[PDB]
Amino acid sequence: GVGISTGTFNNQTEFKFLENGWVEITANSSRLVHLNMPESENYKRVVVNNMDKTAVKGNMALDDIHVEIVTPWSLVDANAWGVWFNPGDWQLIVNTMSELHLVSFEQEIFNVVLKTVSESATQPPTKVYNNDLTASLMVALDSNNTMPFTPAAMRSETLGFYPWKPTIPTPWRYYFQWDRTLIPSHTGTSGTPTNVYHGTDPDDVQFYTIENSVPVHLLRTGDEFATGTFFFDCKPCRLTHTWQTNRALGLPPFLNSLPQSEGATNFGDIGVQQDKRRGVTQMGNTDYITEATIMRPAEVGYSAPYYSFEASTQGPFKTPIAAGDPRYAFGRQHGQKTTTTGETPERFTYIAHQDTGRYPEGDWIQNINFNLPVTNDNVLLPTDPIGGKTGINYTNIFNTYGPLTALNNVPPVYPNGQIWDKEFDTDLKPRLHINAPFVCQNNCPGQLFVKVAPNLTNQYDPDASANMSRIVTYSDFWWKGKLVFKAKLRASHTWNPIQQMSINVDNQFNYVPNNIGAMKIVYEKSQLAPRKLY
């Protein structure tokens, strides 16, 4: 079946309007993947140590020591908005829909090709490329999710973001258990602190192998491989933002005095002594009913320790937060001006709100007796130092998460954000994930692994440390996916128009190529349109 294609190229996205303001978005995405022979046909357990870095009292956060099992397989990840939608599409989705539902997903590998490089060592010397018509491309689709979940979006290693630009899969590797101790220290810290990699705990050792836990298919040119259709089990993602804070929840105080002429200084006036007002308060002490005192239903948002690093058996790690900022570093293949030189990533900090965010500088604590103006001794301000440290206040320690905490889930981040994420297999689970807006609880699509089957030479001896020598082979194959969403059309509820993504005299050139054909994909806001929270 050499002279016959086994698939079709399709990179169109279709919006099929169903019944009652609900539409069905079908994002088709296909690409040409380039894959090289494994640098090593073996599984390696590799340790990464960098104490020297962390050895510098004050450089703890720069800790990279970990252990990973390097597999001879590559992973074809497409989990990132940039892989399915282009700027124009994102505008549409983001501007006219009000919520998105992730529905199904399927992939296929067609028109497989395997070539061979001959080093025609003549003069220059030359180099030749030929077709190995009988060579095979190994494919494995871990449907039962046996293998560790390794989303490539976290290291900006997904498939390209341009339909017309060949891409490639990423070398697959996963974490291996290890013990490590690193004790905090600042510039002044005396003597060498404790910084040591202890090793591996036998009881947590898990050496995974694809061969052993997943059936492998060998695809020759004539062959093709197709995944079935997976249907997710995720909650709907919203494309609306709330803005209210406890200070804007409920019936505003009745103004007994209203302005009588336009004017920035023409304010209205409640017109009632702060301690002779009616209403509800949760302060059994005072008779003071103020906008900061009046009782609200619950609390929109919470406060958490900032730049807090906790430690467990593998080392320190930043205490994650649900507030509002992700920082995305990437490049060339996923945005970053294509013609850009050097090897410095491009990046952005997607800022998302005032929906649950906090201004620490505005926080403060007072003595139960109240008694204002409050005395310095009865107030702990975000200015008074903790532990004697000049740069540490109670807020860095503070946590106001509790039974009344209201909160929203992560918004979509085009085009660098991950789309769906697998849930933790713990008995109690995170009320949300910080990395993706969609989390398949029970079932998530299985990972797809590719690998160029070993093209041996006439000389091969299993019983020899040597290192099998094989014909230089590589494979190019097309990949095609289909991600289906279900979305609801938004409606206008206010008299005033609203936030909409548009092209300006300023963005204009972030959506077109240049005289050299350089390109780039700029990030974009996703939940632009207020929604009444209460």
Add this chain to the structure above:
Amino acid sequence: GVGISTGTFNNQTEFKFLENGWVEITANSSRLVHLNMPESENYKRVVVNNMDKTAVKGNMALDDIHVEIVTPWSLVDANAWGVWFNPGDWQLIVNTMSELHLVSFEQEIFNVVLKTVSESATQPPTKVYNNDLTASLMVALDSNNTMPFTPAAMRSETLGFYPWKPTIPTPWRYYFQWDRTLIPSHTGTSGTPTNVYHGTDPDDVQFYTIENSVPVHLLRTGDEFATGTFFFDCKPCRLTHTWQTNRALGLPPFLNSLPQSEGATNFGDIGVQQDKRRGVTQMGNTDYITEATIMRPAEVGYSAPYYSFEASTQGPFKTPIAAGDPRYAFGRQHGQKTTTTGETPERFTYIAHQDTGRYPEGDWIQNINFNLPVTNDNVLLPTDPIGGKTGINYTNIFNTYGPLTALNNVPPVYPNGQIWDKEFDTDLKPRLHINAPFVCQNNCPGQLFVKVAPNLTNQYDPDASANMSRIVTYSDFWWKGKLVFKAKLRASHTWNPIQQMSINVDNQFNYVPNNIGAMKIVYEKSQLAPRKLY
């Protein structure tokens, strides 16, 4: 039926999504109309003369002389976008739809009320208002369009634009035939030019009366009046704009030399001698194939005489144009800051494009022999004077309308634009109307006329020039309409996002009221989204 309401107030707009990217927009609009007794119960033929103004050699365009028949009836006009949609709605329609179809229209008059004012001439003196429970409000709906078509949008005299602000109908009046001569003159013109109103031509006299050609209903409080549903016969209005001009129609010339490094000065190069190129030209003379010479299918847009005033039996009038600018003057009730003082209208010049527009300064004409660089004697430029006038060039006279003229229809102008317009009853008709995007050819909704029936006093004598004296009466009544459109949802066809109406840190306050409750409705662009013309 005095103590019982006869209608419901509804000012909601509903979008009902049907099948296949088509939605049904139902704009409901109801309002409280205030109506006063006729200043005169009679029909008057009134002449308006202002020669003194036009008598000033050079002030011809300021000619207002006309004759009109003043009727004792008021007209309830709702034909203007501002009456049916608010800013938020217009954004939705304009941003997500790709074409609009005017479908049906119906009105109703309910909860009629008639009051009487008593001048309690005590001290101040006082004033009293009472209910005339047996008084009637006269209503007439000219279904057969017997009466002259007088759209109130042309003089900014529609119903209000705010649901919560009582409005009023406009005194109805229509043109009466008259003869008038006014001869052009400029400041220097010598002797008094000819400026005279000749009178009326018996053969064109048409004195229209509602009583005589329309059935009138008398509505007392308990009564209510409802129009049936009219279905228009108009072409679809587009919500997309084209941008191509003959210079951008077709296969661009093949560049034999392309840039090799980014750079504003790194241009591509056709790479072929202008007279040794292949292609098609409509210039049988030259061998010059240039972007301004190469042959295009037809012509996008045309050129017409500018600030041309033509004259017919009623006087001078500006020669109308289909190009791209309307100027809208209005106020208070239809936009203009509500609290604004004085009596100076608010206004704007809706600029709409580069779709068919022309830059006269760029036009020029040359001798058939061609022969360039062209000699002054073989070129008439938009600079060389015509008729000796320093400020007149051939372009002011010029007209390039013909068999190849491509062209689009008027876009919607929110909120001051008229919605539909009646077609001329001439054997040959305008390929379009400059005042509205929708033109019912055969059938247009009939005009609705209101009038407070005469509340006579005990003293009334028909046979006396006097002037019937009647009890001071006035009526308030609610009006409610329903305009239905059918629209298609737009799709993304380019890789780049597109123009979208949005709220900025700049418009923000054009969509909210002030501390005094002042309000205003700012105009907005309608066909924002390119469409491939060819």
Add this chain to the structure above:
Amino acid sequence: VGYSAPYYSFEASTQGPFKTPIAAGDPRYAFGRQHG
């Protein structure tokens, strides 16, 4: 309503000059005996 056109304009094509026709408002009818 109506338009303006060049008056007493004669154009020429392969058979000679001819008055540029108009849609405005006047026909002139010359006849005799048998038709009035």
